[PDB]
Ligand binder design. Structure first.
Ligand SMILES: CC/C=C\C/C=C\C/C=C\CCCCCCCC(=O)OC[C@@H](O)COP(=O)(O)OCC[N+](C)(C)C
Ligand SMILES: CCCCCCCCCCCCO[C@@H]1O[C@H](CO)[C@@H](O[C@H]2O[C@H](CO)[C@@H](O)[C@H](O)[C@H]2O)[C@H](O)[C@H]1O
Ligand SMILES: CCCCCCCCCCCCO[C@@H]1O[C@H](CO)[C@@H](O[C@H]2O[C@H](CO)[C@@H](O)[C@H](O)[C@H]2O)[C@H](O)[C@H]1O
Ligand SMILES: CCCCCCCCCCCCO[C@@H]1O[C@H](CO)[C@@H](O[C@H]2O[C@H](CO)[C@@H](O)[C@H](O)[C@H]2O)[C@H](O)[C@H]1O
Ligand SMILES: CCCCCCCCCCCCO[C@@H]1O[C@H](CO)[C@@H](O[C@H]2O[C@H](CO)[C@@H](O)[C@H](O)[C@H]2O)[C@H](O)[C@H]1O
Ligand SMILES: CCCCCCCCCCCCO[C@@H]1O[C@H](CO)[C@@H](O[C@H]2O[C@H](CO)[C@@H](O)[C@H](O)[C@H]2O)[C@H](O)[C@H]1O
Ligand SMILES: CCCCCCCCCCCCO[C@@H]1O[C@H](CO)[C@@H](O[C@H]2O[C@H](CO)[C@@H](O)[C@H](O)[C@H]2O)[C@H](O)[C@H]1O
Ligand SMILES: CCCCCCCCCCCCO[C@@H]1O[C@H](CO)[C@@H](O[C@H]2O[C@H](CO)[C@@H](O)[C@H](O)[C@H]2O)[C@H](O)[C@H]1O
Ligand SMILES: CCCCCCCCCCCCO[C@@H]1O[C@H](CO)[C@@H](O[C@H]2O[C@H](CO)[C@@H](O)[C@H](O)[C@H]2O)[C@H](O)[C@H]1O
Ligand SMILES: CCCCCCCCCCCCO[C@@H]1O[C@H](CO)[C@@H](O[C@H]2O[C@H](CO)[C@@H](O)[C@H](O)[C@H]2O)[C@H](O)[C@H]1O
Ligand SMILES: CCCCCCCCCCCCO[C@@H]1O[C@H](CO)[C@@H](O[C@H]2O[C@H](CO)[C@@H](O)[C@H](O)[C@H]2O)[C@H](O)[C@H]1O
Ligand SMILES: CCCCCCCCCCCCO[C@@H]1O[C@H](CO)[C@@H](O[C@H]2O[C@H](CO)[C@@H](O)[C@H](O)[C@H]2O)[C@H](O)[C@H]1O
Ligand SMILES: CCCCCCCCCCCCO[C@@H]1O[C@H](CO)[C@@H](O[C@H]2O[C@H](CO)[C@@H](O)[C@H](O)[C@H]2O)[C@H](O)[C@H]1O
Ligand SMILES: CCCCCCCCCCCCO[C@@H]1O[C@H](CO)[C@@H](O[C@H]2O[C@H](CO)[C@@H](O)[C@H](O)[C@H]2O)[C@H](O)[C@H]1O
Lengths: 460, 203, 201
């Protein structure tokens, strides 16, 4: 009476819409608001910041509501997903819709972006506890987690490919300005965005139906339900630990640098490298290299330890982030740097999850009483990454507004290109250097003590 | 609030050079493109634009006729007009939103490229020996180079036509449809002295 | 440079609705700015990106996809009878078109001819003045010194605030030496199915 491989596959498929919508509204929302929705970058800055700060706000609130959700006739998590998905797909389609409003499109985008973030939180937060609800054996939960991560990586790649190819299929005209003083239409580009959103909404639904049909709930009633009021005490206890706080700050700053790149990289490809016809192919190459470099970094951490792997993987992109702003926009240099950036993305978002069990063992050794420490760590990391990435994207688009970013434009003035070069080559390098310096102060020192802590794991 | 204060009216003479100031306030002048326009009797044109921390971009018609400059120490934009004669117009000083390309805040200054300054002559044109109910009296002001203010003693039935160029001077007419005619006089403006009021007689 | 334009330089609207149309010589991609200008005042921005207001009364809306744009004022008051311009921010060289709204009035012209005064006759000149104080539409004035003449200067005011009627003054300047051609006649042609002639001898 274990999990079937089809049930684990359906559970893994159910986690693809989160990554597809995340990659879409991470890579292309800043393009869509600035260029396709014709918004002032102050208003787009407000929309991006509030949209990525309401998700982080709604993560613990929806978690607390789910912890208080009683047992229905379909489960504790399936009614949330079933009642959240048809409204989430509607709000997601209305994110990429440009209305005919004479005043206040920023209000429309704010309302529907925050509504979609709330409904996607109400979809993903029960889906995270679904792996505890499906089975009681730890091996089945680990297999379901591995399937979920594999389909999460494939969902990021598939969503990037689908959205990029559809919105790059239909081009559009630009705005000639003073700088440039010595068939397709804008409605075609908006319809291409609507078509891509409709395809992604069809995928969302399909995956929601697959998750509902293929996954049961098992009516789990065992052990204890812990204490929801002890959340702040657990946060303080986790933050008091040395290696756990060090891993939190390093992973944070590194993921913040890469989320800043993910946000302001399509504009850098369009307006600095002059690749507005093939800016989606660079994103596809980066995601393909990130997909293919995961076994390479797994072999590297299995072979040459963990310390050198996390030392070189996050900092491999630094010479290439210098090179992209220190060459005259050569095509092959950009594609080689795209392959390198994909390798570095895979390293940055793979290696701390490899570092984590050595810190879990150390926290078990130092604190014998532990309940939900890994969940608390994940929630803290998720909240701070989403909130500070919203701050970073709001500050970046506000800096573009201050620099005089033209809506569309076929070119940018000398201030906007400088701000984009700083936003892909100075701020990510500074954040990566901060994360590397935090990872230097690592008292666990890879496995050299951690396995000894594992020996104490044999003792306790 | 952002505002742009422009110079007053000027009277260049044929082929002089006229400099117009556009002292701005409420915004950093070095961050936005300060523009210049060219409004005739009824037509909006576009000489040029100037970025106060860099380049100047002209229209191909006004290249060599207009020259733009910017002082960021006083936040003042200058337009220098070269040879004239058909440049008697109104020049605006819009600024361009740093994202779109349209002009939210504007100014306005008049340039009148003519020569001479004379005293107006008043002629009381009257009826030619006819009358039926209301009758039309007139007042013709001919030969001046300014903007006058024709008036009547407390009668509001008057129509004062816009002035027109006749050679190098200006001509204006005023018409009053009055019912009774005990006494009517035409009083003109022309703030540069030469104040003359003339009665309107019969025949 | 683009060739954006407004076809109707004059429009008639009283209190119902106005639809000022602008046409672009190139596909501008919905980049049209609409300005409102009152006499003696600079152009005030109403609409940008062809549909978005900037601190303006809610009656001013605007539509248009590409090479065909419109601004609709469905509540036209006394301040709304001004001159409206359409700009384009698609190309480097910015362009305007020019338009104006007017109220709707009935019909009926009036003409009166006035001979030169004795003061003007003394100082070597003779200006014959033809006044057309109240009419609606467009009118044409011809001078007959027993033959058509093309040496007259004509002026028009705007529309009167009370009467909602236009005027026109025609001045014929003739020297004293050329002041013997017979009789002077002023002829006015309006939408009245007949010319109005006023003559002096
Ligand atoms: C086709 C795409 C190629 C690859 C992607 C799939 C990848 C697996 C990547 C990573 C898993 C490594 C991290 C495992 C963490 C387990 C932590 C644990 O041990 O449990 C919680 C204490
Ligand atoms: C993009 C994803 C969708 C791709 C199309 C779907 C293909 C995958 C469908 C699931 C296939 C497994 O479906 C069914 O699972 C049971 C075990 O639970 C299998 O039973 C056995 O088969 C295979 C090997 O022979 C093993 O997976 C399994 O360990 C074994 O128990 C059945 O032979 C199979 O019919
Ligand atoms: C775009 C391409 C998408 C990938 C291919 C389409 C998905 C099809 C399902 C995955 C491929 C086949 O499925 C593969 O079968 C083998 C066994 O034969 C499984 O291996 C395992 O299956 C079940 C899992 O509990 C157990 O019996 C046992 O632990 C082991 O045999 C792999 O976990 C699975 O990866
Ligand atoms: C964008 C994502 C697209 C998603 C598209 C939907 C793909 C969903 C993947 C699973 C598809 C269904 O997979 C289905 O699983 C059941 C598991 O019992 C298999 O059923 C099989 O398993 C049992 C195992 O005891 C066998 O005895 C028997 O041969 C058979 O009934 C089916 O042969 C397989 O077709
Ligand atoms: C998953 C894909 C399937 C999705 C199915 C639903 C898709 C519907 C297509 C979008 C249609 C909505 O289109 C949009 O609606 C709103 C509300 O009616 C309108 O908004 C309107 O109401 C507001 C509030 O009164 C005012 O600003 C104004 O009257 C007007 O703008 C927009 O002008 C219109 O652009
Ligand atoms: C979660 C809280 C988010 C806080 C973030 C900061 C507040 C929101 C930032 C954008 C607010 C913009 O402010 C808003 O702009 C536009 C015009 O400019 C107008 O917005 C309004 O326009 C018309 C008015 O009939 C209607 O469609 C509608 O009522 C509304 O959209 C309002 O006049 C103003 O309330
Ligand atoms: C848009 C959606 C696209 C649909 C994508 C569908 C592709 C699905 C990918 C199939 C993943 C194959 O999963 C395969 O099976 C086994 C389970 O027996 C998994 O699990 C295996 O690795 C984990 C590692 O901790 C261990 O628990 C154990 O070694 C083993 O169970 C592995 O992850 C993988 O080897
Ligand atoms: C290109 C078509 C679409 C992509 C199809 C790809 C199908 C094959 C990938 C499915 C997932 C493979 O999952 C693979 O499982 C094996 C175990 O069997 C893991 O092997 C190992 O990794 C994990 C850590 O990640 C450890 O717990 C352990 O050392 C071991 O299980 C691989 O690291 C993992 O990558
Ligand atoms: C494993 C990753 C792939 C799995 C996800 C599936 C995404 C595949 C593309 C989805 C969109 C399909 O529709 C897409 O439309 C455009 C034209 O309209 C075309 O896409 C085209 O764009 C680029 C633009 O330079 C061309 O170089 C190329 O010839 C072609 O790929 C294809 O027809 C198709 O890629
Ligand atoms: C993983 C499962 C999902 C895989 C991805 C979904 C299947 C592939 C996507 C199909 C739809 C995208 O492909 C899209 O289709 C439409 C309809 O012909 C076409 O696009 C058409 O509409 C747009 C909008 O007016 C215009 O550019 C033009 O009229 C035409 O190109 C192109 O082919 C492509 O832009
Ligand atoms: C698989 C393809 C998925 C496509 C999207 C499916 C969602 C279905 C619900 C929404 C349908 C599309 O939504 C509708 O599309 C048309 C274009 O075709 C848009 O465009 C419409 O208004 C604009 C306004 O200028 C017109 O230029 C255009 O001619 C007209 O068709 C509408 O603004 C939008 O309301
Ligand atoms: C939570 C983490 C947050 C991380 C967010 C990262 C945001 C990074 C902000 C980058 C802003 C760059 O700011 C940009 O720098 C250059 C040089 O300093 C400056 O711009 C400069 O160029 C112009 C030339 O026209 C000169 O007038 C002057 O030398 C200066 O203003 C401005 O300051 C700004 O245009
Ligand atoms: C930490 C890793 C460093 C890798 C690179 C990080 C990005 C920062 C440098 C980007 C390159 C552009 O940086 C910028 O280039 C131009 C010339 O091209 C230089 O020169 C500039 O100085 C003045 C400053 O008022 C500007 O008005 C003007 O646009 C330009 O002449 C600047 O001094 C330099 O700041
Ligand atoms: C809590 C999240 C952060 C919220 C920060 C607080 C902001 C609250 C909303 C204030 C928005 C108004 O702030 C500012 O007002 C001016 C009013 O002319 C707007 O207008 C500005 O851009 C428009 C074009 O878009 C120009 O026509 C105008 O000349 C210019 O002043 C700006 O679009 C807006 O940047």
């Amino acid at each position: 009476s274990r999990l079937s491989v089809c049930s684990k596959l359906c559970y893994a498929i159910g986690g693809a819409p989160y990554q597809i919508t995340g990659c879409a509204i991470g890579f292309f929302l800043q393009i869509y608001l600035l260029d396709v929705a014709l918004l002032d970058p102050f208003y787009a800055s407000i929309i991006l910041f509030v949209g990525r700060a309401w998700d982080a706000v709604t993560d613990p609130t929806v978690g607390f509501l789910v912890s208080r959700t009683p047992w229905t006739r379909f489960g504790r998590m399936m009614p949330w997903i079933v009642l959240s998905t048809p409204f989430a797909v509607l709000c997601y389609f209305l994110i990429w819709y440009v209305p005919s409003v004479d005043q206040g499109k920023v209000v429309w985008y704010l309302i529907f972006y925050c509504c979609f973030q709330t409904l996607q939180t109400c979809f993903h937060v029960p889906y995270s506890a679904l792996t505890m609800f499906i089975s009681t054996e730890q091996k089945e939960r680990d297999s379901a987690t591995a399937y979920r991560m594999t389909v999460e990586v494939l969902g990021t790649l598939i969503g990037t490919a689908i959205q990029g190819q559809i919105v790059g299929m239909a081009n559009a005209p630009c705005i000639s300005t003073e700088i440039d003083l010595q068939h397709v239409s804008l409605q075609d580009l908006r319809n291409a965005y609507m078509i891509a959103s409709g395809v992604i909404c069809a995928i969302y639904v399909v995956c929601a139906v697959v998750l509902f049909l293929g996954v049961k709930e098992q009516k789990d009633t065992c052990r204890v339900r812990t204490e929801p009021m002890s959340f702040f005490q657990g946060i303080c206890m986790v933050m008091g630990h040395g290696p756990y706080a060090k891993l939190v700050m390093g992973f944070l700053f590194t993921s913040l640098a890469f989320m800043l790149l993910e946000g302001n990289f399509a504009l850098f490809c369009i307006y600095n490298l002059g690749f507005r016809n093939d800016f989606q192919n660079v994103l596809l190459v980066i995601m393909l290299s990130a997909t293919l470099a995961i076994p390479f970094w797994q072999w590297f951490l299995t072979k040459f330890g963990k310390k050198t792997a996390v030392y070189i993987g996050t900092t491999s992109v630094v010479p290439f982030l210098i090179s992209v702003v220190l060459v005259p926009s050569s095509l092959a240099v950009t594609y080689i740097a795209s392959f390198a950036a994909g390798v570095s993305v895979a390293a940055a978002f793979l290696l701390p999850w490899s570092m984590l069990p050595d810190v879990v063992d150390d926290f078990k050794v130092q604190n014998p009483e532990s309940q939900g420490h890994e969940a608390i760590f994940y929630s803290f990391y998720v909240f701070f990454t989403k909130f500070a990435s919203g701050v970073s994207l709001g500050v970046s688009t506000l800096s573009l507004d201050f620099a005089g970013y033209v809506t569309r434009g076929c070119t940018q003035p000398g201030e906007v290109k400088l701000t984009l070069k700083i936003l892909v080559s100075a701020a990510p390098i500074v954040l990566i250097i901060i994360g590397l310096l935090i990872f230097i102060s690592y008292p666990i020192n890879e496995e050299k003590r951690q396995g000894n802590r594992k020996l104490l794991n044999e003792q306790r | 609030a952002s505002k742009l204060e422009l110079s007053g009216p000027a009277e260049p003479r044929g082929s002089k050079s006229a400099q117009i100031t556009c002292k701005a306030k409420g915004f950093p002048e070095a961050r936005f493109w300060v523009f210049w326009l060219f409004q005739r009797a009824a037509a909006l044109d576009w000489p040029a634009a100037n970025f106060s921390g860099g380049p100047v971009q002209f229209e191909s018609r006004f290249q060599g006729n207009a020259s733009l400059k910017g002082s960021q120490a006083q936040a003042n934009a200058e337009l220098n007009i070269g040879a004239l004669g058909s440049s008697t117009a109104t020049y605006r000083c819009g600024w361009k939103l740093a994202n779109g390309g349209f002009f939210p805040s504007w100014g306005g200054a008049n340039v009148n490229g003519a020569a001479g300054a004379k005293a107006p002559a008043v002629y009381p044109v009257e009826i030619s020996g006819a009358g039926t109910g209301s009758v039309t009296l007139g007042c013709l002001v001919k030969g001046y180079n300014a903007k006058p203010n024709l008036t009547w003693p407390g009668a509001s039935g008057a129509l004062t036509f816009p002035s027109e160029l006749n050679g190098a001077l200006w001509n204006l007419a005023s018409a009053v449809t009055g019912s009774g005619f005990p006494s009517a006089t035409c009083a003109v403006g022309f703030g540069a002295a030469t104040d003359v009021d003339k009665k309107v007689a019969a025949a | 440079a683009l060739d954006i334009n407004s076809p109707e330089a004059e429009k008639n609207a009283k209190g119902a609705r106005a639809r000022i149309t602008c046409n672009a010589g190139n596909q501008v991609g919905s980049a049209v700015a609409w300005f409102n200008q009152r006499p003696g005042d600079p152009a005030s921005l109403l609409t940008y990106w062809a549909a978005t207001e900037k601190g303006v009364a809610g009656k001013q809306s605007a539509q248009g996809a590409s090479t065909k744009f419109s601004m609709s004022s469905a509540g036209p008051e006394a301040p709304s009878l001004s001159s409206y311009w359409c700009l384009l921010f698609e190309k480097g060289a910015f362009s305007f078109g020019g338009s104006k709204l007017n109220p709707r009035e009935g019909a009926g012209p009036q003409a009166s001819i006035l001979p030169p005064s004795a003061d003007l006759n003394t100082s070597g000149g003779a200006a014959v003045v033809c006044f057309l104080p109240n009419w609606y539409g467009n009118i044409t004035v011809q001078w007959k010194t027993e033959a058509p003449q093309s040496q007259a200067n004509m002026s028009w005011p705007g529309q009167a605030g009370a009467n909602a009627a236009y005027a026109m003054a025609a001045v014929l300047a003739i020297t004293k030496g050329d002041y013997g051609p017979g009789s002077f006649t002023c002829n006015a042609s309006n939408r009245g199915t007949g010319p109005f002639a006023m003559s002096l001898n």
